[PDB]
Design a protein around this ligand. Sequence first.
Ligand code: 4NP
Length: 159
Amino acid sequence: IEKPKISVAFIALGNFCRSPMAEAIFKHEVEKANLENRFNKIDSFGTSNYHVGESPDHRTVSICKQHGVKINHKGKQIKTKHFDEYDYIIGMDESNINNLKKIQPEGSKAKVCLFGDWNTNDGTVQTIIEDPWYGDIQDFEYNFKQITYFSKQFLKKEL
Ligand SMILES: O=[N+]([O-])c1ccc(OP(=O)(O)O)cc1
């Protein structure tokens, strides 16, 4: 087939604040655009195992609920083997990218990229989805705006 079903994995450090939000929003945008048929797996993970088994940060959940975006997730860690199970392994910031590239096996199919690679750079949003941990609910809302923006760009540019 010329239009293969795509598998996407969103990565952050804890799979607690940003990546579960990225997965939730991306699935939401796929559904709104009736593009389910173009995707196999859409998941989120963390480079660390610090929040394995836990539901997302209450602030990420509150932001998703405020926008009417469903979210249901338990923390999980990205592994070297996953690089052959996903077409895109998308990090939030450069520190995520650094770690992913160091565990990326040679020849694996996944393309490691920054979600912000899909930014238009037209000034609407910043490219790096910054860790909101030490910030507050506004930083989480901004991550939501960034992720929604890149999700729509990704759907328009990669399919
Ligand atoms: O404690 N922390 O610094 C911390 C913990 C979990 C986080 O979640 P992430 O956005 O999925 O990496 C982000 C930051």
